[PDB]
Amino acid sequence: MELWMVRHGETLWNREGRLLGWTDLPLTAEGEAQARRLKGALPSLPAFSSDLLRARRTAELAGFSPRLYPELREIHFGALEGALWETLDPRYKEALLRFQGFHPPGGESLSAFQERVFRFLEGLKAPAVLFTHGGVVRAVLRALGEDGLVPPGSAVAVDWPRRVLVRLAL
Numbered sequence: 395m396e397l398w399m400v401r402h403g404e405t406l407w408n409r410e411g412r413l414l415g416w417t418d419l420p421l422t423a424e425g426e427a428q429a430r431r432l433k434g435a436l437p438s439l440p441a442f443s444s445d446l447l448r449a450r451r452t453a454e455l456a457g458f459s460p461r462l463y464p465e466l467r468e469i470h471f472g473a474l475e476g477a478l479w480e481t482l483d484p485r486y487k488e489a490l491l492r493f494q495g496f497h498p499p500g501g502e503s504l505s506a507f508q509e510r511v512f513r514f515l516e517g518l519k520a521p522a523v524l525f526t527h528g529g530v531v532r533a534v535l536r537a538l539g540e541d542g543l544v545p546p547g548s549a550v551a552v553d554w555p556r557r558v559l560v561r562l563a564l
C-alpha cells in the first residue's frame with residue numbers, strides 16, 4: 395500500500411531541541427511556510443491526520459481536509475514533555491537514539507506507541523497521505539530497515555509494509 399507520511403512543520407521545540415509529544419505546540423512561522431510548500435506537491439489522496447494542532451494545521455496549509463485520528467499522535471513523553479535533550483538522562487537519550495526500551499515516566503512505552511501506529515497503518519484500505527509526527531515516521535522507516543530521520547515539514551512515501559518509495563524534501 396502506497397502511504398505518504400508527512401512530518402508536521404517546525405515548532406519552537408523541534409528547533410530548540412526539546413522533546414515534543416502530546417504538548418499541543420503550534421507551528422512556527424517557518425513551520426507554516428513548510429506546510430504551505432507541500433500544497434500541490436503531494437498526490438491529492440484522501441488525508442488522515444493526528445489530532446494535535448500542529449499536525450492539523452500542516453494538513454490545512456498543504457491543501458487537505460483530513461480526518462482526525464489520535465493514533466497518529468507523536469509518542470506521549472509524560473513527565474519528559476518539553477525536556478531539554480542536552481540534560482536528558484543518558485539512559486533515556488540512549489534508548490531514544492536506539493529507538494528501543496524507552497518508556498518516559500507518565501508517557502507511553504515505545505512498544506505501545508509503535509503498536510497503535512502500525513495498527514493504524516494496517517487499517518488503511520487505499521493509498522493516503524498521513525499528516526503525523528517525527529516519531530511516527532521514524533517507527534515506520536526503522537521497521538523497514540531504513541533510517542527514520544526526515545526533516546520537519548518533509549514527506550516520505552512508502553509501499554507498506556515493504557519499502558521506501560520516495561523522499562520529498564523541498
Ligand SMILES: [Cl-]
Binds near residue numbers: 402527529
Ligand atoms: Cl516531530
